Amino acid sequence: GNFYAVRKGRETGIYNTWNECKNQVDGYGGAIYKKFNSYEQAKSFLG
Q1: What does the record's miscellaneous section state?
Q2: Domains in the chain and their CATH numbers?
């Protein structure tokens, strides 16, 4: 899968999986989720 700096709402945060990816954001009419491939960038994004 991949890494995901997600935080649209609810228990979220950075992910690192195929499921965590689509699972945390699958369909989402317009979720925020900041896709990433390195918690270092995704985390640097979260602030």
Answers
A1: Present with 149 molecules/cell in log phase SD medium.
A2: 1-47 (3.40.970.10)
Torsion angle, CA of 40/45/14/1, rounded to 10 degrees? -70
Nearest C-alpha neighbor of 12 from the set 36, 32, 37: 32
Provide the token pair at 45: 């994004």
**Hunting for tokens 């989402």 — which residue is that?**
28
Q: Which residues pair with 2 in a beta bridge?
A: 17
Contact between 2 and 36 under an 8 Å Cβ cutoff? The reply is: yes
